[PDB]
CSV table of N, CA and C and ligand atoms in Angstrom, one decimal:
chain,number,residue,atom,x,y,z
A,1,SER,N,-4.5,3.7,8.9
A,1,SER,CA,-3.5,4.7,8.6
A,1,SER,C,-2.1,4.1,8.6
A,2,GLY,N,-1.1,4.7,7.9
A,2,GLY,CA,0.2,4.3,7.8
A,2,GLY,C,0.9,4.7,6.5
A,3,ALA,N,2.2,4.7,6.5
A,3,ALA,CA,3.0,5.2,5.4
A,3,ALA,C,4.4,4.4,5.4
A,4,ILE,N,5.0,4.4,4.2
A,4,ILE,CA,6.4,3.9,4.0
A,4,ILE,C,7.3,5.1,3.9
A,5,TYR,N,8.3,5.2,4.7
A,5,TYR,CA,9.3,6.3,4.6
A,5,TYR,C,10.6,5.8,4.1
A,6,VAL,N,10.9,6.1,2.8
A,6,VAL,CA,12.1,5.6,2.2
A,6,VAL,C,12.9,6.7,1.5
A,7,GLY,N,14.1,6.9,1.9
A,7,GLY,CA,14.9,8.1,1.4
A,7,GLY,C,14.3,9.4,1.7
A,8,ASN,N,14.0,10.2,0.7
A,8,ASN,CA,13.2,11.4,0.9
A,8,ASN,C,11.8,11.3,0.4
A,9,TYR,N,11.2,10.2,0.6
A,9,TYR,CA,9.8,9.9,0.1
A,9,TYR,C,8.9,9.3,1.2
A,10,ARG,N,7.6,9.6,1.1
A,10,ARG,CA,6.6,9.1,1.9
A,10,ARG,C,5.6,8.5,1.0
A,11,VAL,N,5.3,7.2,1.2
A,11,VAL,CA,4.4,6.5,0.3
A,11,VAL,C,3.1,6.3,1.1
A,12,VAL,N,2.0,6.8,0.7
A,12,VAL,CA,0.7,6.6,1.4
A,12,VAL,C,-0.4,6.1,0.5
A,13,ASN,N,-1.5,5.7,1.0
A,13,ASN,CA,-2.7,5.3,0.2
A,13,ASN,C,-3.2,6.7,-0.4
A,14,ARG,N,-3.3,6.7,-1.7
A,14,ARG,CA,-3.7,8.0,-2.4
A,14,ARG,C,-5.1,8.5,-1.7
A,15,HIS,N,-6.0,7.6,-1.4
A,15,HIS,CA,-7.3,8.1,-0.8
A,15,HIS,C,-7.1,8.6,0.6
A,16,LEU,N,-6.0,8.5,1.3
A,16,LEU,CA,-5.7,9.0,2.6
A,16,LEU,C,-4.7,10.1,2.6
A,17,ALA,N,-4.2,10.6,1.5
A,17,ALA,CA,-3.2,11.6,1.4
A,17,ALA,C,-3.7,12.9,2.0
A,18,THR,N,-2.8,13.7,2.7
A,18,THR,CA,-3.1,14.9,3.3
A,18,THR,C,-2.9,16.1,2.4
A,19,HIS,N,-3.3,17.4,2.8
A,19,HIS,CA,-3.0,18.6,2.1
A,19,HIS,C,-1.4,18.7,1.9
A,20,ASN,N,-0.6,18.3,2.9
A,20,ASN,CA,0.8,18.4,2.8
A,20,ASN,C,1.3,17.4,1.8
A,21,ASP,N,0.8,16.2,1.7
A,21,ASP,CA,1.2,15.2,0.7
A,21,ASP,C,1.0,15.8,-0.7
A,22,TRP,N,-0.2,16.4,-0.9
A,22,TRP,CA,-0.5,17.0,-2.2
A,22,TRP,C,0.4,18.2,-2.5
A,23,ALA,N,0.7,19.0,-1.5
A,23,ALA,CA,1.6,20.2,-1.7
A,23,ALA,C,3.1,19.8,-2.0
A,24,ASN,N,3.5,18.6,-1.6
A,24,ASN,CA,4.8,18.1,-1.8
A,24,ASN,C,4.8,16.8,-2.7
A,25,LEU,N,3.8,16.8,-3.7
A,25,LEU,CA,3.6,15.6,-4.6
A,25,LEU,C,4.8,15.3,-5.4
A,26,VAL,N,5.1,14.0,-5.5
A,26,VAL,CA,6.2,13.5,-6.4
A,26,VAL,C,5.6,12.7,-7.5
A,27,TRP,N,4.6,11.8,-7.2
A,27,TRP,CA,3.9,11.0,-8.1
A,27,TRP,C,2.6,10.4,-7.5
A,28,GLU,N,1.6,10.3,-8.2
A,28,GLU,CA,0.3,9.7,-7.8
A,28,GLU,C,-0.3,8.8,-8.9
A,29,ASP,N,-1.0,7.8,-8.5
A,29,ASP,CA,-1.7,6.9,-9.5
A,29,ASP,C,-3.0,6.4,-8.8
A,30,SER,N,-4.1,7.0,-9.3
A,30,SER,CA,-5.4,6.6,-8.8
A,30,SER,C,-5.7,5.2,-9.0
A,31,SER,N,-5.2,4.6,-10.2
A,31,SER,CA,-5.5,3.2,-10.5
A,31,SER,C,-4.7,2.2,-9.5
A,32,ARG,N,-3.7,2.7,-8.8
A,32,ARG,CA,-3.0,1.9,-7.8
A,32,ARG,C,-3.3,2.2,-6.4
A,33,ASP,N,-4.1,3.3,-6.2
A,33,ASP,CA,-4.4,3.9,-4.9
A,33,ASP,C,-3.1,4.3,-4.2
A,34,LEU,N,-2.2,4.8,-5.0
A,34,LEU,CA,-0.9,5.2,-4.4
A,34,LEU,C,-0.6,6.7,-4.6
A,35,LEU,N,0.1,7.3,-3.6
A,35,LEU,CA,0.6,8.7,-3.7
A,35,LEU,C,2.0,8.7,-3.0
A,36,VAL,N,2.9,9.4,-3.6
A,36,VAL,CA,4.3,9.6,-3.0
A,36,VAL,C,4.5,11.1,-2.9
A,37,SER,N,5.0,11.5,-1.7
A,37,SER,CA,5.3,12.9,-1.5
A,37,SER,C,6.7,13.0,-0.9
A,38,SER,N,7.3,14.2,-1.0
A,38,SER,CA,8.7,14.4,-0.6
A,38,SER,C,8.8,14.8,0.9
A,39,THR,N,9.9,14.3,1.6
A,39,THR,CA,10.1,14.6,3.0
A,39,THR,C,11.5,15.3,3.1
A,40,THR,N,11.6,16.1,4.2
A,40,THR,CA,12.9,16.7,4.5
A,40,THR,C,13.9,15.7,5.2
A,41,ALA,N,13.3,14.9,6.1
A,41,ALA,CA,14.1,14.0,6.9
A,41,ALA,C,14.3,12.6,6.1
A,42,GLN,N,15.4,11.9,6.4
A,42,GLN,CA,15.6,10.6,5.8
A,42,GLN,C,14.7,9.5,6.4
A,43,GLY,N,14.1,8.6,5.6
A,43,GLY,CA,13.2,7.6,6.0
A,43,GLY,C,13.8,6.4,6.7
A,44,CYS,N,13.0,5.7,7.5
A,44,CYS,CA,13.3,4.5,8.3
A,44,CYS,C,13.3,3.2,7.5
A,45,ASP,N,12.5,3.1,6.5
A,45,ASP,CA,12.2,1.9,5.7
A,45,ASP,C,13.2,1.6,4.5
A,46,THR,N,13.2,0.3,4.1
A,46,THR,CA,13.9,-0.2,2.9
A,46,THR,C,12.9,-1.0,2.1
A,47,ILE,N,13.0,-1.0,0.7
A,47,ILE,CA,12.0,-1.7,-0.1
A,47,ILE,C,12.5,-3.0,-0.7
A,48,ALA,N,11.6,-4.0,-0.6
A,48,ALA,CA,11.9,-5.4,-1.1
A,48,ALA,C,11.9,-5.3,-2.7
A,49,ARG,N,12.9,-5.9,-3.3
A,49,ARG,CA,13.0,-6.0,-4.7
A,49,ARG,C,13.0,-7.6,-5.0
A,50,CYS,N,11.9,-8.2,-5.0
A,50,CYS,CA,11.7,-9.6,-5.0
A,50,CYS,C,10.4,-10.0,-5.7
A,51,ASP,N,10.2,-11.3,-5.7
A,51,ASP,CA,8.9,-11.9,-6.2
A,51,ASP,C,8.3,-12.8,-5.0
A,52,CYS,N,8.5,-12.4,-3.8
A,52,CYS,CA,7.9,-13.1,-2.6
A,52,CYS,C,6.4,-13.1,-2.7
A,53,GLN,N,5.8,-14.2,-2.3
A,53,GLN,CA,4.3,-14.3,-2.3
A,53,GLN,C,3.9,-14.7,-0.8
A,54,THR,N,4.8,-14.6,0.2
A,54,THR,CA,4.5,-14.9,1.6
A,54,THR,C,5.2,-13.7,2.3
A,55,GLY,N,4.5,-13.2,3.4
A,55,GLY,CA,4.9,-12.1,4.2
A,55,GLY,C,4.1,-11.9,5.4
A,56,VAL,N,4.4,-10.8,6.1
A,56,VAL,CA,3.7,-10.5,7.3
A,56,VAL,C,3.2,-9.0,7.2
A,57,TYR,N,2.0,-8.8,7.5
A,57,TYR,CA,1.4,-7.4,7.5
A,57,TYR,C,0.9,-7.0,8.9
A,58,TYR,N,0.9,-5.7,9.1
A,58,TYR,CA,0.4,-5.2,10.4
A,58,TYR,C,-1.1,-4.8,10.2
A,59,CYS,N,-1.9,-5.3,11.2
A,59,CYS,CA,-3.3,-5.1,11.2
A,59,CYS,C,-3.7,-4.2,12.4
A,60,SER,N,-3.9,-2.9,12.2
A,60,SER,CA,-4.1,-2.0,13.3
A,60,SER,C,-5.5,-2.2,14.0
A,61,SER,N,-6.5,-2.8,13.3
A,61,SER,CA,-7.8,-3.2,13.9
A,61,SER,C,-7.7,-4.3,14.8
A,62,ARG,N,-6.5,-5.0,14.9
A,62,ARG,CA,-6.2,-6.1,15.9
A,62,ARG,C,-5.0,-5.8,16.7
A,63,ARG,N,-4.2,-4.7,16.4
A,63,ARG,CA,-2.9,-4.4,17.0
A,63,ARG,C,-2.0,-5.6,16.9
A,64,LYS,N,-1.9,-6.2,15.7
A,64,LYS,CA,-1.2,-7.5,15.5
A,64,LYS,C,-0.7,-7.6,14.1
A,65,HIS,N,0.4,-8.4,14.0
A,65,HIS,CA,1.0,-8.7,12.7
A,65,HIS,C,0.4,-10.1,12.4
A,66,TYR,N,0.2,-10.4,11.1
A,66,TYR,CA,-0.3,-11.7,10.6
A,66,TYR,C,0.5,-12.2,9.4
A,67,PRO,N,0.8,-13.4,9.4
A,67,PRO,CA,1.5,-14.0,8.2
A,67,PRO,C,0.5,-14.2,7.1
A,68,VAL,N,0.8,-13.9,5.8
A,68,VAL,CA,-0.1,-14.1,4.7
A,68,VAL,C,0.6,-14.7,3.5
A,69,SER,N,-0.2,-15.3,2.6
A,69,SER,CA,0.2,-15.9,1.3
A,69,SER,C,-0.6,-15.0,0.4
A,70,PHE,N,0.1,-14.2,-0.5
A,70,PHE,CA,-0.6,-13.2,-1.3
A,70,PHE,C,-0.4,-13.5,-2.8
A,71,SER,N,-1.3,-13.1,-3.6
A,71,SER,CA,-1.2,-13.2,-5.0
A,71,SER,C,-0.2,-12.3,-5.7
A,72,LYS,N,0.2,-12.5,-6.9
A,72,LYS,CA,1.1,-11.7,-7.7
A,72,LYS,C,0.3,-10.4,-8.0
A,73,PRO,N,1.0,-9.3,-8.1
A,73,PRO,CA,0.3,-8.0,-8.5
A,73,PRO,C,-0.6,-8.1,-9.7
A,74,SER,N,-1.8,-7.7,-9.6
A,74,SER,CA,-2.8,-7.8,-10.7
A,74,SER,C,-3.9,-6.7,-10.8
A,75,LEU,N,-4.7,-6.7,-11.9
A,75,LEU,CA,-5.8,-5.8,-12.0
A,75,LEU,C,-7.0,-6.5,-11.4
A,76,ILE,N,-7.5,-5.9,-10.4
A,76,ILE,CA,-8.7,-6.5,-9.6
A,76,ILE,C,-9.8,-5.5,-9.6
A,77,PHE,N,-11.0,-5.9,-9.8
A,77,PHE,CA,-12.2,-5.0,-9.7
A,77,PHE,C,-12.5,-4.7,-8.3
A,78,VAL,N,-12.6,-3.4,-8.0
A,78,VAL,CA,-12.9,-2.8,-6.7
A,78,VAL,C,-14.2,-2.0,-6.8
A,79,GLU,N,-15.2,-2.4,-6.0
A,79,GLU,CA,-16.5,-1.8,-5.9
A,79,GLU,C,-16.4,-0.3,-5.5
A,80,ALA,N,-17.4,0.5,-6.0
A,80,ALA,CA,-17.4,1.9,-5.6
A,80,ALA,C,-17.3,2.2,-4.1
A,81,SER,N,-16.8,3.3,-3.7
A,81,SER,CA,-16.7,3.7,-2.3
A,81,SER,C,-16.7,5.3,-2.3
A,82,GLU,N,-16.7,5.9,-1.1
A,82,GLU,CA,-16.7,7.3,-1.0
A,82,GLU,C,-15.5,8.0,-1.7
A,83,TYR,N,-14.4,7.3,-1.8
A,83,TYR,CA,-13.1,7.7,-2.4
A,83,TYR,C,-13.0,7.5,-3.9
A,84,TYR,N,-13.5,6.4,-4.5
A,84,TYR,CA,-13.4,6.1,-5.9
A,84,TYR,C,-14.6,5.6,-6.5
A,85,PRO,N,-14.8,5.8,-7.8
A,85,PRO,CA,-15.9,5.1,-8.5
A,85,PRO,C,-15.5,3.6,-8.7
A,86,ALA,N,-16.5,2.8,-9.1
A,86,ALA,CA,-16.2,1.3,-9.3
A,86,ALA,C,-15.2,1.2,-10.4
A,87,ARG,N,-14.1,0.5,-10.2
A,87,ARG,CA,-13.0,0.5,-11.2
A,87,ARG,C,-12.1,-0.8,-11.0
A,88,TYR,N,-11.1,-0.9,-11.9
A,88,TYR,CA,-10.1,-1.9,-11.7
A,88,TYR,C,-8.9,-1.3,-11.1
A,89,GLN,N,-8.3,-1.8,-10.0
A,89,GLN,CA,-7.2,-1.3,-9.3
A,89,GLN,C,-6.0,-2.2,-9.7
A,90,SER,N,-5.0,-1.6,-10.3
A,90,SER,CA,-3.8,-2.4,-10.8
A,90,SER,C,-2.8,-2.6,-9.7
A,91,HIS,N,-1.8,-3.5,-9.9
A,91,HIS,CA,-0.7,-3.8,-9.0
A,91,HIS,C,-1.2,-4.2,-7.6
A,92,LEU,N,-2.4,-4.8,-7.5
A,92,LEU,CA,-3.0,-5.2,-6.3
A,92,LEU,C,-2.8,-6.7,-6.0
A,93,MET,N,-2.5,-7.0,-4.7
A,93,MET,CA,-2.2,-8.4,-4.3
A,93,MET,C,-3.2,-8.8,-3.3
A,94,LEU,N,-3.9,-9.9,-3.5
A,94,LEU,CA,-4.9,-10.4,-2.5
A,94,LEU,C,-4.4,-11.5,-1.6
A,95,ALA,N,-4.9,-11.5,-0.4
A,95,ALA,CA,-4.6,-12.5,0.6
A,95,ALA,C,-5.8,-12.7,1.6
A,96,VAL,N,-5.9,-13.8,2.2
A,96,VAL,CA,-6.9,-14.1,3.2
A,96,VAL,C,-6.3,-13.6,4.5
A,97,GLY,N,-7.0,-12.7,5.2
A,97,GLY,CA,-6.6,-12.2,6.4
A,97,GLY,C,-7.6,-11.1,6.9
A,98,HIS,N,-7.7,-10.9,8.2
A,98,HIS,CA,-8.5,-9.8,8.7
A,98,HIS,C,-8.1,-8.4,8.3
A,99,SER,N,-9.1,-7.6,7.8
A,99,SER,CA,-8.9,-6.2,7.6
A,99,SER,C,-10.2,-5.4,7.6
A,100,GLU,N,-10.2,-4.2,8.0
A,100,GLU,CA,-11.2,-3.2,8.1
A,100,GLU,C,-10.7,-1.9,7.4
A,101,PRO,N,-11.6,-1.0,6.9
A,101,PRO,CA,-11.1,0.2,6.1
A,101,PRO,C,-9.9,1.0,6.7
A,102,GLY,N,-10.0,1.2,8.0
A,102,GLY,CA,-9.0,1.9,8.8
A,102,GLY,C,-7.6,1.2,8.8
A,103,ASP,N,-7.6,0.0,8.3
A,103,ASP,CA,-6.3,-0.8,8.3
A,103,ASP,C,-5.4,-0.4,7.1
A,104,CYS,N,-6.0,0.4,6.1
A,104,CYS,CA,-5.2,0.9,5.0
A,104,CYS,C,-4.0,1.6,5.5
A,105,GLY,N,-2.8,1.4,4.8
A,105,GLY,CA,-1.6,1.9,5.3
A,105,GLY,C,-0.7,1.0,6.1
A,106,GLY,N,-1.3,-0.1,6.6
A,106,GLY,CA,-0.4,-1.1,7.3
A,106,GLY,C,0.5,-1.7,6.3
A,107,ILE,N,1.8,-1.9,6.8
A,107,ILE,CA,2.8,-2.5,5.9
A,107,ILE,C,2.8,-4.0,5.8
A,108,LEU,N,3.0,-4.5,4.6
A,108,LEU,CA,3.2,-5.9,4.2
A,108,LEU,C,4.8,-5.9,4.0
A,109,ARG,N,5.4,-6.9,4.7
A,109,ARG,CA,6.8,-7.0,4.7
A,109,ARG,C,7.2,-8.5,4.4
A,110,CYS,N,8.2,-8.7,3.7
A,110,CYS,CA,8.8,-10.1,3.5
A,110,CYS,C,10.2,-10.0,4.2
A,111,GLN,N,11.0,-11.1,4.0
A,111,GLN,CA,12.4,-11.1,4.5
A,111,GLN,C,13.3,-10.1,3.8
A,112,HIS,N,12.9,-9.6,2.6
A,112,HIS,CA,13.7,-8.6,1.8
A,112,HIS,C,13.4,-7.1,2.1
A,113,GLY,N,12.3,-6.8,2.8
A,113,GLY,CA,11.9,-5.5,3.1
A,113,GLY,C,10.4,-5.3,2.9
A,114,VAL,N,10.0,-4.0,2.6
A,114,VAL,CA,8.7,-3.6,2.4
A,114,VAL,C,8.2,-4.0,1.1
A,115,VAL,N,7.1,-4.7,1.0
A,115,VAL,CA,6.4,-5.2,-0.2
A,115,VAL,C,5.4,-4.2,-0.7
A,116,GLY,N,4.5,-3.8,0.3
A,116,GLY,CA,3.4,-2.8,0.0
A,116,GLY,C,2.6,-2.4,1.2
A,117,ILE,N,1.5,-1.8,0.9
A,117,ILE,CA,0.6,-1.3,2.0
A,117,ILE,C,-0.9,-1.8,1.8
A,118,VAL,N,-1.6,-1.9,2.9
A,118,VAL,CA,-3.0,-2.3,2.9
A,118,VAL,C,-3.8,-1.3,2.1
A,119,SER,N,-4.6,-1.7,1.1
A,119,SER,CA,-5.3,-0.8,0.2
A,119,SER,C,-6.8,-1.2,0.1
A,120,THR,N,-7.1,-2.5,0.1
A,120,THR,CA,-8.5,-3.0,0.0
A,120,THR,C,-8.7,-4.1,1.1
A,121,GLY,N,-9.9,-4.7,1.2
A,121,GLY,CA,-10.2,-5.8,2.1
A,121,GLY,C,-11.6,-6.1,2.2
A,122,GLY,N,-12.0,-6.7,3.4
A,122,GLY,CA,-13.4,-7.0,3.7
A,122,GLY,C,-13.6,-8.5,3.5
A,123,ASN,N,-14.6,-9.1,4.3
A,123,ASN,CA,-15.0,-10.5,4.2
A,123,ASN,C,-13.9,-11.5,4.4
A,124,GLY,N,-13.0,-11.3,5.2
A,124,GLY,CA,-11.9,-12.2,5.4
A,124,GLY,C,-10.7,-12.0,4.4
A,125,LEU,N,-10.8,-11.0,3.6
A,125,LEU,CA,-9.7,-10.7,2.7
A,125,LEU,C,-9.0,-9.4,3.0
A,126,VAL,N,-7.7,-9.3,2.5
A,126,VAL,CA,-6.9,-8.1,2.6
A,126,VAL,C,-6.1,-7.9,1.3
A,127,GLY,N,-6.2,-6.7,0.7
A,127,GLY,CA,-5.5,-6.4,-0.6
A,127,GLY,C,-4.4,-5.4,-0.3
A,128,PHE,N,-3.2,-5.6,-0.9
A,128,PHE,CA,-2.1,-4.8,-0.7
A,128,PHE,C,-1.7,-4.1,-2.0
A,129,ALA,N,-1.3,-2.9,-2.0
A,129,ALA,CA,-0.9,-2.1,-3.1
A,129,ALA,C,0.6,-2.4,-3.2
A,130,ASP,N,1.1,-3.0,-4.2
A,130,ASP,CA,2.5,-3.4,-4.4
A,130,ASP,C,3.3,-2.1,-4.6
A,131,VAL,N,4.6,-2.1,-4.1
A,131,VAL,CA,5.5,-1.0,-4.3
A,131,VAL,C,6.9,-1.5,-4.8
A,132,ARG,N,7.1,-2.8,-4.9
A,132,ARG,CA,8.4,-3.4,-5.3
A,132,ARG,C,8.8,-3.0,-6.7
A,133,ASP,N,7.9,-2.6,-7.6
A,133,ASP,CA,8.3,-2.2,-9.0
A,133,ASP,C,8.7,-0.8,-9.1
A,134,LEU,N,8.5,0.0,-8.0
A,134,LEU,CA,8.8,1.5,-8.0
A,134,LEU,C,10.3,1.6,-7.6
A,135,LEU,N,11.2,1.4,-8.6
A,135,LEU,CA,12.6,1.4,-8.4
A,135,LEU,C,13.2,2.7,-8.1
A,136,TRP,N,12.6,3.8,-8.6
A,136,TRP,CA,13.0,5.2,-8.3
A,136,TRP,C,12.9,5.6,-6.8
A,137,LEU,N,12.2,4.8,-6.0
A,137,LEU,CA,12.1,5.1,-4.6
A,137,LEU,C,13.4,5.0,-3.9
A,138,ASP,N,14.4,4.2,-4.4
A,138,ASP,CA,15.7,4.0,-3.9
A,138,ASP,C,16.8,4.9,-4.4
A,139,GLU,N,16.4,5.9,-5.1
A,139,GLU,CA,17.4,6.9,-5.7
A,139,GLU,C,16.8,8.3,-5.7
B,1,LIG,N1,-8.4,1.0,-2.7
B,1,LIG,C1,-9.7,1.3,-2.6
B,1,LIG,O1,-10.3,1.6,-3.6
B,1,LIG,C2,-10.3,1.2,-1.2
B,1,LIG,C3,-10.8,2.6,-0.7
B,1,LIG,C4,-11.4,2.4,0.7
B,1,LIG,C5,-12.5,1.4,0.6
B,1,LIG,N2,-12.1,0.1,0.0
B,1,LIG,C6,-12.2,-1.1,0.6
B,1,LIG,O2,-11.9,-2.1,0.0
B,1,LIG,C7,-12.6,-1.2,2.1
B,1,LIG,C8,-13.8,-2.2,2.3
B,1,LIG,S1,-13.5,-3.2,3.7
B,1,LIG,C9,-11.8,-2.8,3.7
B,1,LIG,C10,-10.8,-3.4,4.5
B,1,LIG,C11,-9.5,-3.0,4.4
B,1,LIG,C12,-9.2,-1.9,3.5
B,1,LIG,C13,-10.1,-1.4,2.7
B,1,LIG,C14,-11.5,-1.8,2.8
B,1,LIG,C15,-11.5,0.3,-1.3
B,2,LIG,ZN1,10.9,-10.8,-0.6
């Protein structure tokens, strides 16, 4: 679990969105596993606007932050699950690091701010849904 709170927006994994997230929907994209909903209170986070490929993510299944080298956002095949049929997930960045399904929502951060959130993983990998291209989050 986990979310990004920026301005009057809450960014979560679309597969983990609540009834409240859907009732206050701003934008969603099943192909990115992303959902953005509106909040009344101002958010704590700021978004990186960069091309960093190194960062630090929070892994709740270890209660630890880990440094990672991650790929550029891309279309990656994701095997079927309870949440989605087998498909290509876009704007996904892969890295070697520990992750378990409950780790989705953990923030990936670089020196510039929030890069994205944990969305995929398994077998020593961790996939992050990029948010750096979502410029409208800052306005
Ligand atoms: N974005 C999706 O389609 C995901 C929906 C939940 C299941 N997905 C996974 O990759 C799991 C497998 S082991 C793991 C480890 C960290 C995170 C997720 C996962 C796919
Ligand atoms: Zn950066």
